[PDB]
Coordinates of C-alpha atoms and ligand atoms in Angstrom, one line a residue:
Chain O
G1 CA 136.2 43.7 115.4
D2 CA 134.8 42.4 118.1
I3 CA 134.1 44.5 121.5
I4 CA 136.3 43.6 124.6
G5 CA 134.9 44.5 127.7
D6 CA 131.7 45.6 128.6
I7 CA 129.3 47.8 126.4
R8 CA 128.5 51.5 127.0
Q9 CA 127.6 54.4 125.3
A10 CA 130.0 57.7 124.9
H11 CA 129.3 60.7 126.9
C12 CA 130.6 64.3 127.9
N13 CA 130.7 66.3 131.1
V14 CA 130.7 69.6 132.1
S15 CA 130.9 71.2 135.7
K16 CA 127.6 73.1 136.4
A17 CA 129.3 75.6 138.5
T18 CA 131.3 76.8 136.0
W19 CA 128.6 76.5 133.3
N20 CA 125.9 78.5 135.0
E21 CA 128.6 81.0 136.1
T22 CA 129.6 81.7 132.2
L23 CA 126.0 82.5 131.2
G24 CA 125.0 84.4 134.0
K25 CA 128.2 86.5 133.4
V26 CA 127.5 86.8 129.5
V27 CA 123.4 87.0 130.0
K28 CA 124.2 90.6 131.6
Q29 CA 126.2 92.0 128.9
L30 CA 123.7 90.8 126.2
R31 CA 121.0 93.3 127.9
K32 CA 122.9 96.2 126.8
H33 CA 122.2 95.9 123.3
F34 CA 118.5 94.7 123.7
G35 CA 117.2 96.4 127.4
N36 CA 117.2 96.3 130.7
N37 CA 114.1 94.6 131.5
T38 CA 114.6 91.7 128.9
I39 CA 113.9 88.1 129.6
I40 CA 116.5 85.5 127.6
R41 CA 115.8 82.3 127.3
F42 CA 118.2 79.3 125.7
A43 CA 116.3 76.8 123.2
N44 CA 118.3 73.5 121.9
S45 CA 117.4 74.0 117.7
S46 CA 115.6 71.1 116.1
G47 CA 116.0 68.4 113.5
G48 CA 118.8 69.5 110.8
Chain Q
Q1 CA 93.1 96.7 108.7
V2 CA 91.9 94.0 106.4
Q3 CA 88.0 92.9 106.8
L4 CA 87.2 89.1 105.2
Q5 CA 83.9 88.3 103.7
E6 CA 82.3 84.9 104.2
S7 CA 80.2 83.8 101.1
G8 CA 77.6 80.7 100.6
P9 CA 74.3 79.6 99.8
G10 CA 71.7 80.8 102.3
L11 CA 69.1 78.1 102.1
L12 CA 70.6 74.4 102.1
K13 CA 68.9 71.1 101.8
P14 CA 70.1 68.1 103.7
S15 CA 72.1 65.5 102.2
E16 CA 73.9 67.7 100.1
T17 CA 77.6 69.0 98.9
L18 CA 77.8 72.3 101.2
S19 CA 80.5 74.3 99.2
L20 CA 81.2 77.6 101.5
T21 CA 83.7 80.3 100.0
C22 CA 85.6 82.5 101.9
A23 CA 85.9 85.6 99.8
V24 CA 89.4 86.9 100.2
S25 CA 90.1 90.3 100.2
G26 CA 93.0 92.5 99.0
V27 CA 95.4 90.5 100.2
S28 CA 96.4 87.9 98.2
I29 CA 96.8 84.1 99.0
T30 CA 100.7 84.8 98.7
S31 CA 100.5 86.7 101.9
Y32 CA 99.5 85.2 105.6
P33 CA 97.5 81.9 105.0
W34 CA 94.2 81.5 106.4
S35 CA 91.7 78.5 108.3
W36 CA 88.6 77.2 109.1
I37 CA 86.8 77.6 112.3
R38 CA 83.3 76.0 113.1
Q39 CA 81.0 77.6 115.1
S40 CA 78.0 75.2 117.1
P41 CA 75.3 76.6 119.2
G42 CA 75.2 74.5 123.0
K43 CA 78.4 73.6 122.1
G44 CA 82.2 74.6 122.0
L45 CA 84.2 75.9 119.1
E46 CA 85.1 73.4 116.9
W47 CA 88.1 73.1 114.1
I48 CA 88.2 72.4 110.6
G49 CA 91.5 72.8 108.9
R50 CA 94.4 75.3 108.0
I51 CA 95.9 76.1 104.5
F52 CA 98.9 77.7 103.3
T53 CA 99.8 79.5 100.3
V54 CA 101.6 76.7 98.8
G55 CA 99.2 74.2 100.5
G56 CA 101.4 71.1 101.4
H57 CA 100.8 69.7 104.9
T58 CA 97.2 71.5 105.1
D59 CA 96.0 69.6 108.7
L60 CA 92.8 69.0 109.3
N61 CA 91.2 67.5 112.3
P62 CA 91.5 63.8 112.6
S63 CA 87.5 63.5 113.2
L64 CA 86.5 64.8 109.8
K65 CA 89.7 64.1 108.1
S66 CA 87.9 61.7 105.5
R67 CA 84.9 64.2 105.1
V68 CA 85.7 67.7 104.6
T69 CA 88.6 68.7 102.4
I70 CA 90.3 72.8 102.0
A71 CA 91.2 73.6 98.4
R72 CA 93.0 76.8 97.2
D73 CA 93.0 78.7 93.6
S74 CA 95.3 81.4 93.3
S75 CA 93.4 82.5 90.2
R76 CA 90.3 82.7 91.4
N77 CA 91.8 84.3 94.9
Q78 CA 89.3 82.0 97.1
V79 CA 89.2 79.3 99.1
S80 CA 86.2 76.7 99.7
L81 CA 85.5 73.6 101.6
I82 CA 84.0 70.4 100.7
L83 CA 81.3 69.0 103.0
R84 CA 79.1 66.0 102.0
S85 CA 76.8 63.8 104.7
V86 CA 75.5 66.9 106.6
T87 CA 74.6 66.1 110.4
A88 CA 71.3 67.5 112.6
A89 CA 73.9 69.9 114.5
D90 CA 75.3 71.8 110.9
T91 CA 72.9 74.6 111.3
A92 CA 75.3 77.1 112.5
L93 CA 78.2 79.8 111.8
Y94 CA 81.4 79.3 110.1
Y95 CA 84.2 81.5 110.5
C96 CA 87.0 82.7 107.9
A97 CA 90.3 84.5 109.3
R98 CA 93.8 84.3 109.0
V99 CA 97.1 84.1 111.1
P100 CA 99.1 87.2 111.5
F101 CA 102.4 86.5 113.2
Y102 CA 105.4 84.5 112.5
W103 CA 108.2 82.9 114.0
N104 CA 111.1 81.5 112.6
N105 CA 115.0 81.4 112.1
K106 CA 118.2 80.0 110.2
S107 CA 117.7 76.9 112.8
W108 CA 114.2 75.9 113.1
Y109 CA 113.8 73.2 110.2
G110 CA 115.9 75.2 108.4
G111 CA 114.1 78.7 107.8
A112 CA 110.4 76.8 107.9
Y113 CA 107.3 79.1 108.8
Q114 CA 105.5 79.1 112.1
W115 CA 101.8 80.6 111.9
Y116 CA 100.4 81.0 115.5
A117 CA 97.3 83.0 115.7
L118 CA 93.8 83.9 114.5
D119 CA 93.2 87.4 113.0
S120 CA 89.9 89.4 112.6
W121 CA 86.8 87.3 112.1
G122 CA 84.4 87.2 109.6
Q123 CA 80.9 87.8 109.7
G124 CA 79.2 84.3 109.9
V125 CA 77.4 82.2 107.9
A126 CA 73.6 81.6 108.6
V127 CA 72.1 78.5 107.5
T128 CA 68.8 76.9 107.3
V129 CA 69.0 73.1 106.6
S130 CA 65.3 71.9 106.3
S131 CA 62.6 70.2 104.0
Chain W
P1 CA 124.3 60.3 125.9
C2 CA 124.7 60.7 122.2
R3 CA 126.0 58.4 118.8
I4 CA 129.1 58.0 116.7
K5 CA 129.0 58.0 113.1
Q6 CA 132.1 57.1 110.9
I7 CA 131.4 58.5 107.4
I8 CA 130.7 62.1 107.7
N9 CA 130.4 65.2 105.5
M10 CA 132.8 67.9 106.8
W11 CA 132.5 71.2 104.2
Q12 CA 129.4 69.1 102.7
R13 CA 130.9 68.8 99.6
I14 CA 127.9 66.5 98.0
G15 CA 130.3 65.0 95.7
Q16 CA 132.9 63.4 98.3
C17 CA 132.7 62.1 101.7
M18 CA 135.2 60.5 103.9
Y19 CA 135.4 56.8 106.2
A20 CA 136.5 57.3 109.7
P21 CA 138.9 54.4 110.3
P22 CA 138.7 52.9 113.9
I23 CA 141.4 53.9 116.9
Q24 CA 142.7 51.2 119.0
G25 CA 142.2 51.6 123.0
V26 CA 140.3 54.5 124.1
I27 CA 140.0 58.2 123.6
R28 CA 139.9 60.6 126.8
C29 CA 140.3 64.4 124.9
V30 CA 140.2 67.1 127.3
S31 CA 139.5 70.7 125.7
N32 CA 138.5 74.1 126.2
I33 CA 135.4 76.3 125.6
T34 CA 136.2 79.3 124.2
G35 CA 132.8 80.9 122.2
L36 CA 129.8 80.2 121.3
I37 CA 127.2 81.0 118.0
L38 CA 123.9 82.2 118.7
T39 CA 120.7 83.3 116.2
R40 CA 118.1 85.2 117.1
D41 CA 114.6 84.2 116.3
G42 CA 111.8 86.1 114.0
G43 CA 110.4 89.3 114.3
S44 CA 107.1 88.0 116.1
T45 CA 106.4 91.4 117.9
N46 CA 107.8 93.5 120.6
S47 CA 108.0 91.2 123.1
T48 CA 110.6 91.4 126.2
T49 CA 110.6 87.4 126.1
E50 CA 113.8 87.2 123.6
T51 CA 115.0 83.7 123.3
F52 CA 118.4 82.9 121.7
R53 CA 119.0 79.9 119.9
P54 CA 122.3 78.0 118.6
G55 CA 123.0 78.0 114.9
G56 CA 126.6 76.7 113.7
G57 CA 126.9 74.7 110.4
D58 CA 128.7 78.0 108.6
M59 CA 132.8 77.4 108.7
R60 CA 133.5 81.1 107.2
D61 CA 132.1 82.1 111.3
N62 CA 134.3 79.7 112.8
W63 CA 137.6 81.3 111.7
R64 CA 136.0 85.0 111.8
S65 CA 136.5 84.8 115.8
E66 CA 140.3 84.5 115.0
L67 CA 140.9 86.8 112.4
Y68 CA 138.8 89.7 113.8
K69 CA 142.1 91.8 114.6
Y70 CA 143.9 91.9 111.3
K71 CA 143.6 93.6 107.9
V72 CA 146.1 93.6 105.1
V73 CA 147.4 97.1 103.8
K74 CA 149.2 97.8 100.4
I75 CA 152.4 100.1 101.0
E76 CA 152.9 102.7 98.3
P77 CA 156.5 104.2 98.2
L78 CA 155.5 106.7 96.4
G79 CA 154.6 110.3 97.7
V80 CA 154.1 114.2 97.2
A81 CA 154.9 117.3 99.0
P82 CA 155.3 120.9 98.1
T83 CA 159.2 122.0 99.2
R84 CA 161.1 125.1 98.0
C85 CA 163.9 123.5 96.3
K86 CA 165.2 124.4 92.9
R87 CA 167.1 121.8 90.4
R88 CA 170.3 123.7 89.2
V89 CA 171.0 122.8 85.1
Chain V
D1 CA 91.6 65.8 121.2
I2 CA 92.0 67.2 124.8
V3 CA 89.1 69.1 126.3
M4 CA 89.6 72.2 128.3
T5 CA 87.8 73.8 131.5
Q6 CA 87.0 77.2 132.3
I7 CA 86.5 78.7 135.6
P8 CA 84.6 80.7 136.4
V9 CA 81.7 79.9 134.0
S10 CA 79.5 83.1 135.4
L11 CA 81.1 86.2 136.5
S12 CA 79.4 89.3 138.1
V13 CA 81.4 92.3 138.3
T14 CA 80.7 96.1 139.1
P15 CA 82.9 98.5 136.9
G16 CA 85.7 99.1 138.4
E17 CA 86.0 95.9 140.4
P18 CA 89.4 94.1 138.8
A19 CA 88.3 90.3 137.8
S20 CA 90.1 87.3 137.1
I21 CA 89.4 84.3 135.0
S22 CA 90.9 80.9 134.6
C23 CA 91.5 78.1 132.0
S24 CA 93.1 74.6 132.7
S25 CA 94.0 71.9 130.8
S26 CA 95.6 68.4 131.2
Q27 CA 98.5 68.2 128.7
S28 CA 101.2 70.6 129.3
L29 CA 101.1 73.1 126.9
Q30 CA 104.8 73.9 126.6
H31 CA 105.6 73.4 122.6
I32 CA 108.5 70.9 121.6
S33 CA 111.3 73.5 122.3
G34 CA 108.9 76.4 122.1
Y35 CA 106.6 78.5 123.4
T36 CA 102.8 77.9 125.0
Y37 CA 100.3 78.8 122.6
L38 CA 97.1 80.2 123.8
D39 CA 95.1 83.3 123.1
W40 CA 91.9 85.0 124.7
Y41 CA 88.9 85.7 122.0
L42 CA 86.0 88.0 123.2
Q43 CA 82.8 87.2 121.7
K44 CA 80.5 90.5 121.5
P45 CA 77.1 89.3 120.8
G46 CA 76.2 91.1 117.5
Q47 CA 79.9 92.0 116.6
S48 CA 82.7 90.4 115.0
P49 CA 85.3 88.3 117.3
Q50 CA 88.7 89.8 117.5
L51 CA 92.3 88.3 119.2
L52 CA 93.4 90.0 122.2
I53 CA 96.4 88.0 124.0
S54 CA 98.9 86.5 121.8
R55 CA 101.2 83.6 122.8
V56 CA 100.8 83.8 126.7
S57 CA 101.2 87.2 127.7
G58 CA 102.0 89.2 124.3
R59 CA 99.5 91.9 123.6
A60 CA 98.9 92.3 119.9
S61 CA 97.4 95.5 119.1
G62 CA 93.9 97.4 120.1
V63 CA 92.1 98.0 123.4
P64 CA 94.6 95.6 125.5
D65 CA 95.6 98.0 128.2
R66 CA 93.0 96.6 130.5
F67 CA 93.8 92.5 129.7
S68 CA 97.0 90.8 131.3
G69 CA 97.5 87.3 131.8
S70 CA 100.4 85.2 132.7
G71 CA 101.8 82.5 134.2
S72 CA 103.6 79.3 132.9
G73 CA 100.1 77.7 132.7
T74 CA 98.8 74.4 133.1
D75 CA 95.6 76.3 134.7
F76 CA 96.1 79.2 132.9
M77 CA 95.1 82.6 134.2
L78 CA 93.9 85.6 133.0
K79 CA 93.8 89.2 135.3
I80 CA 91.7 92.6 134.1
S81 CA 93.2 95.9 135.6
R82 CA 89.9 97.5 135.0
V83 CA 86.7 96.5 133.8
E84 CA 85.2 99.1 131.0
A85 CA 82.0 99.8 129.8
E86 CA 83.0 97.5 126.6
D87 CA 83.8 94.6 128.4
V88 CA 80.5 92.9 127.5
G89 CA 80.7 89.8 125.7
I90 CA 81.7 85.8 126.3
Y91 CA 85.1 84.5 126.7
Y92 CA 86.8 81.9 125.3
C93 CA 90.2 79.6 125.7
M94 CA 91.9 78.3 123.2
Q95 CA 94.9 76.0 122.8
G96 CA 96.8 75.2 119.8
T97 CA 99.8 72.8 121.3
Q98 CA 99.9 69.9 118.5
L99 CA 97.1 68.8 116.9
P100 CA 93.7 70.0 117.2
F101 CA 93.9 74.0 117.9
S102 CA 90.9 73.5 119.6
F103 CA 88.7 75.9 121.5
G104 CA 87.4 75.9 125.0
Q105 CA 83.4 76.7 126.4
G106 CA 83.2 80.1 127.2
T107 CA 82.1 82.3 129.9
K108 CA 79.6 84.8 130.3
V109 CA 79.9 88.4 132.0
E110 CA 77.3 90.4 133.6
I111 CA 77.6 93.9 134.6
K112 CA 76.0 96.0 137.6
Ligands
LIG1 C1 142.4 71.0 121.9 O1 143.2 70.9 122.7 C2 143.5 70.0 123.5 C3 144.8 70.3 124.8 O2 145.9 70.7 124.2 C4 143.8 68.8 122.8 O3 144.0 67.2 123.9 C5 145.2 66.4 123.6 O4 145.4 66.3 122.6 C6 146.7 65.8 122.1 C7 146.7 65.1 120.5 O5 146.1 64.2 120.9 C8 146.7 64.6 123.0 O6 148.5 64.6 123.1 C9 148.8 63.3 122.3 O7 147.8 62.3 121.7 C10 147.8 61.1 121.1 C11 146.4 60.5 121.6 O8 146.5 59.7 120.3 C12 147.8 58.8 120.2 O9 147.5 57.5 119.8 C13 147.5 56.4 118.9 C14 147.9 55.0 119.6 O10 148.4 54.3 118.8 C15 149.1 56.8 118.3 O11 149.0 56.2 117.1 C16 148.7 58.2 117.7 O12 149.7 58.5 117.1 C17 148.5 59.5 118.6 O13 149.7 59.5 119.5 C18 149.4 60.6 122.0 O14 150.1 60.3 121.2 C19 149.6 61.2 123.4 O15 149.7 60.2 124.4 C20 150.5 59.1 124.7 O16 152.2 60.3 124.7 C21 152.2 60.8 125.7 C22 153.1 61.9 125.8 O17 153.0 62.7 124.7 C23 151.9 59.9 127.3 O18 152.0 61.0 128.5 C24 151.1 59.3 127.1 O19 150.8 58.3 128.3 C25 150.9 58.4 125.8 O20 152.1 57.4 126.0 C26 149.1 62.4 123.7 O21 148.0 62.0 124.7 C27 147.0 65.4 124.7 O22 147.0 64.4 125.8 C28 145.7 65.7 124.8 N1 145.5 66.4 126.1 C29 145.8 67.7 126.6 C30 146.9 68.2 125.9 O23 145.8 67.7 127.6 C31 142.7 68.7 122.0 O24 143.1 67.7 120.8 C32 142.6 70.1 120.8 N2 141.5 69.7 119.9 C33 140.4 70.0 119.9 C34 139.5 69.4 119.1 O25 140.1 69.9 121.4
LIG2 C1 115.4 69.5 121.5 O1 114.7 69.7 122.8 C2 113.2 69.4 122.7 C3 112.4 69.3 123.3 O2 112.8 68.7 124.5 C4 113.7 68.1 122.2 O3 112.0 67.3 121.6 C5 112.4 66.0 121.9 O4 112.6 65.0 120.8 C6 112.3 63.5 120.9 C7 112.9 62.9 120.1 O5 113.0 61.6 120.6 C8 110.8 63.4 121.3 O6 110.9 62.0 121.8 C9 110.4 61.3 120.8 O7 108.6 62.0 120.4 C10 107.9 61.1 119.5 C11 106.7 61.4 119.7 O8 106.2 61.9 121.2 C12 105.3 63.0 121.5 O9 104.2 63.0 120.5 C13 103.6 61.5 120.8 C14 102.5 61.4 119.6 O10 103.1 61.3 118.3 C15 102.7 61.6 121.9 O11 102.1 60.5 122.5 C16 103.9 61.6 122.9 O12 103.2 62.0 124.4 C17 104.6 62.8 123.0 O13 103.9 64.2 122.7 C18 108.2 59.6 119.1 O14 108.4 59.3 118.6 C19 109.3 58.9 120.5 O15 108.9 57.8 121.3 C20 108.4 56.6 121.2 O16 109.6 56.1 119.5 C21 110.7 56.4 119.4 C22 111.7 56.3 118.5 O17 111.4 57.0 117.8 C23 111.1 55.3 121.1 O18 112.3 55.1 121.3 C24 110.4 55.4 122.2 O19 110.5 54.4 123.1 C25 108.5 55.5 121.8 O20 108.4 54.1 121.2 C26 109.8 59.8 121.1 O21 109.5 60.0 122.5 C27 110.5 64.2 122.5 O22 109.0 64.0 122.7 C28 110.3 65.6 122.1 N1 110.2 66.4 123.3 C29 108.9 67.2 123.8 C30 108.5 67.7 125.0 O23 107.8 66.2 123.1 C31 114.5 67.8 121.0 O24 114.7 66.6 120.4 C32 115.4 68.5 121.4 N2 116.4 68.3 119.8 C33 118.1 68.1 119.8 C34 118.5 68.3 118.5 O25 118.7 67.9 121.0
LIG3 C1 130.1 38.6 114.9 O1 129.1 37.2 114.1 C2 130.2 36.6 114.3 C3 129.5 35.0 113.1 O2 129.0 35.6 112.3 C4 131.1 36.2 115.5 O3 132.1 35.1 115.0 C5 132.2 34.1 115.9 O4 132.9 34.1 117.2 C6 132.6 33.1 118.1 C7 133.2 33.4 119.4 O5 135.1 33.3 119.0 C8 133.3 31.7 117.0 O6 132.9 30.4 117.9 C9 132.3 31.9 115.7 O7 132.8 30.5 115.1 C10 132.4 33.0 115.0 N1 131.6 33.0 113.8 C11 132.2 33.2 112.7 C12 131.4 32.6 111.5 O8 133.3 33.2 112.1 C13 131.2 37.2 115.9 O9 132.0 37.1 117.5 C14 130.5 38.6 116.5 N2 131.0 39.3 117.3 C15 130.3 40.1 118.4 C16 131.4 41.2 118.9 O10 129.3 39.6 118.8
LIG4 C1 130.8 61.5 133.2 O1 130.2 61.1 134.4 C2 129.2 60.3 134.3 C3 128.2 60.6 135.4 O2 128.5 60.6 136.5 C4 130.9 59.6 134.4 O3 129.9 57.9 134.9 C5 130.6 57.5 135.6 O4 131.6 57.3 136.2 C6 132.1 56.5 137.7 C7 133.4 56.9 137.7 O5 133.7 56.0 139.1 C8 131.3 55.2 137.4 O6 131.6 54.8 139.0 C9 129.7 55.7 137.5 O7 129.0 54.3 137.7 C10 129.5 56.3 136.3 N1 128.0 57.0 136.0 C11 127.2 57.3 136.8 C12 125.9 57.7 136.8 O8 128.4 58.4 137.5 C13 131.8 59.6 134.1 O9 132.9 58.9 134.5 C14 132.2 60.9 133.5 N2 133.4 61.0 133.0 C15 134.6 61.6 133.3 C16 135.5 61.2 131.9 O10 134.7 62.2 134.0
LIG5 C1 104.9 97.7 119.2 O1 105.3 97.7 117.9 C2 104.1 97.6 117.2 C3 104.6 97.2 115.5 O2 105.6 98.1 114.9 C4 103.6 99.6 117.2 O3 102.0 98.8 116.6 C5 101.9 100.8 116.0 O4 101.9 101.3 117.1 C6 101.7 102.6 116.7 C7 101.5 103.4 118.3 O5 101.3 105.1 117.7 C8 100.5 102.7 115.5 O6 100.0 103.7 115.5 C9 100.8 101.9 114.8 O7 99.6 101.7 114.0 C10 101.1 100.7 115.1 N1 101.5 99.7 114.0 C11 100.8 98.4 113.8 C12 100.2 97.9 115.0 O8 101.6 97.6 112.9 C13 103.4 99.4 118.9 O9 103.2 100.8 119.0 C14 105.0 99.2 119.6 N2 104.7 99.6 120.9 C15 105.3 99.9 121.3 C16 105.0 100.3 123.0 O10 106.1 100.7 121.0
NAG6 C1 129.5 41.1 127.8 O1 129.8 41.2 126.4 C2 131.2 41.0 126.0 C3 131.1 41.3 124.6 O2 132.8 41.3 124.3 C4 131.7 39.5 126.5 O3 133.3 39.8 126.4 C5 131.6 39.2 128.1 O4 132.3 38.2 128.3 C6 130.1 39.6 128.7 N1 130.2 39.4 130.0 C7 129.3 38.5 130.4 C8 129.0 38.4 132.2 O5 128.4 37.7 129.6
NAG7 C1 122.4 80.1 138.1 O1 122.6 81.0 138.7 C2 121.8 82.0 138.7 C3 122.5 83.0 140.0 O2 123.3 83.7 139.8 C4 120.7 81.5 139.5 O3 119.3 82.2 139.6 C5 120.2 80.0 138.3 O4 118.9 79.3 138.9 C6 121.1 79.4 138.3 N1 121.0 78.5 137.3 C7 121.4 76.8 137.0 C8 120.7 76.3 135.9 O5 121.7 76.7 138.1
NAG8 C1 120.9 98.9 131.9 O1 122.2 98.3 132.6 C2 123.2 99.1 132.2 C3 124.7 98.0 132.7 O2 124.3 96.6 131.9 C4 123.1 100.2 133.4 O3 124.6 101.4 133.1 C5 122.3 101.3 133.2 O4 122.0 102.0 133.5 C6 120.7 100.4 132.8 N1 119.8 100.9 132.1 C7 118.9 101.1 133.4 C8 117.7 102.1 132.9 O5 118.4 100.8 134.5
NAG9 C1 142.3 76.1 128.8 O1 142.5 77.0 129.0 C2 143.8 77.2 130.0 C3 143.7 78.3 130.5 O2 144.9 78.7 131.8 C4 144.9 76.7 129.3 O3 146.3 76.6 130.4 C5 144.6 75.1 128.7 O4 145.9 74.9 128.3 C6 143.3 75.4 128.2 N1 143.4 74.1 127.3 C7 143.1 72.9 128.2 C8 142.7 71.6 127.7 O5 142.9 72.8 129.8

């Protein structure tokens, strides 16, 4: 039906400190399988 | 190593349909695709267009979009370029080469193939357009 | 920012779908993230610059992270082994 | 349609003296959620052109134990560890970001 109040957009939040620390803790682990001097970059995929 | 060879008439006349054919070597069309590269004395290199095993997209330069055309033929194992309405700066060299490398996965457009390179170039085409 | 749509295709099942009814009030859900799904790139060359990209879309992989410690077994009570014994008549 | 700039246009270097060249572009060469497409080609007079540097730093195959270029880009750069007697020719800078897959101008080399 009709909307009561202001019109906003849904969103989500994640703590920067927690997220980066987890990535920094998992990135080192993955280097064992591939190599010590391996550069790791993360992408976001495209239309699906 | 696989070496390509260019083909086409040596002597050419102005205002004629220029049909340049690249002699595809042992590696068939189904394999790595090719592309056309233009040379020009006194000016920087210019792009002609790409091609694919199944054609389809076959992106070309917008400047010459309505003048040049790229066609493929699996049976003939050759790729040809159709050009008309020649210009004064058409006395140059044409190069034919392929794209070695590919890069794809299960997420990029659902297995789409991305090609970014230029393989060993051809010997070039020498032309003399005059009366 | 993002978007919300009502009709969905979960377990894609081309032949069917479902409509999402509206929810009264507002929704404020809090949860955890326990795992990630990653997919490697193509076999370009021996490049130290390696990129990992999220995947998803396969439901079978979702439950593989919770049943990876289990394996069903079949018990056979019957057994054979030599022994020094004699059956009297 | 974008125009490239090659600097230095004319380079003179003694054998054994490392030399550096730069290529610049206006629009950023960062593909949409991808890598940066840029390659260096050697135009030896009387010989066939060859590809020597892939992506931004990847060395495909062949001679490149002497060519090494890196950096994020914008003003792209290439470095040479040592200059060999077979380093005679004309350089080329190519950008293939989205539409044109166009090339650069070029750069000659002089030996002493
Ligand atoms: C992952 O795990 C997290 C953490 O557990 C889950 O988050 C919890 O989700 C549950 C289920 O939604 C929450 O518990 C209750 O949810 C209900 C919200 O929807 C109600 O609203 C309509 C209103 O008409 C009802 O008709 C409908 O039936 C639903 O019941 C409410 O029932 C609850 O709130 C009410 O009751 C509680 C007491 O139980 C009161 O304190 C509230 O004031 C209110 O009156 C309640 O919220 C729970 O709150 C969520 N957060 C937690 C536990 O921290 C995720 O759902 C789960 N899943 C995913 C995908 O992440
Ligand atoms: C993963 O991450 C990548 C990298 O950030 C994201 O890629 C971006 O995708 C968005 C999608 O909106 C792109 O934005 C849109 O791009 C379109 C084209 O812009 C480019 O191309 C034109 C020429 O065609 C150039 O002039 C321009 O400079 C750009 O190079 C346009 O369609 C859009 O703008 C117009 O249309 C929209 C409606 O479609 C209007 O709302 C706009 O106001 C405007 O009129 C728009 O800009 C964005 O360009 C991409 N990034 C880059 C760096 O190019 C992926 O989207 C992301 N994927 C996921 C799933 O998150
Ligand atoms: C959507 O549009 C309808 C009409 O198409 C709106 O209904 C009107 O609401 C006003 C305010 O209460 C009434 O005065 C009108 O008589 C209603 N019109 C009809 C035809 O019933 C409705 O409010 C709109 N909704 C939103 C969220 O903008
Ligand atoms: C998620 O983060 C956004 C962005 O910070 C929050 O939106 C803000 O909410 C506060 C609440 O006091 C408002 O004063 C701000 O105007 C909002 N906008 C911005 C840009 O900060 C949002 O509240 C957060 N959501 C949750 C659930 O914590
Ligand atoms: C990087 O991978 C390529 C492709 O496998 C390797 O190229 C081979 O190199 C050897 C070196 O002896 C040659 O004999 C082969 O002909 C090459 N094969 C090709 C180009 O397909 C290359 O050696 C690898 N590099 C390293 C440092 O291991
Ligand atoms: C904003 O729009 C909403 C829609 O529900 C309406 O109720 C409200 O009165 C509007 N506010 C103003 C200040 O016009
Ligand atoms: C994450 O932390 C590392 C150091 O542990 C730092 O180098 C990096 O910039 C941080 N990343 C972000 C996105 O803040
Ligand atoms: C690589 O890192 C691992 C730990 O992840 C360490 O044990 C190992 O010694 C390292 N190897 C080298 C060659 O530095
Ligand atoms: C997340 O993990 C913590 C770990 O202590 C657990 O207590 C909690 O229930 C989980 N869920 C949420 C929403 O925090």
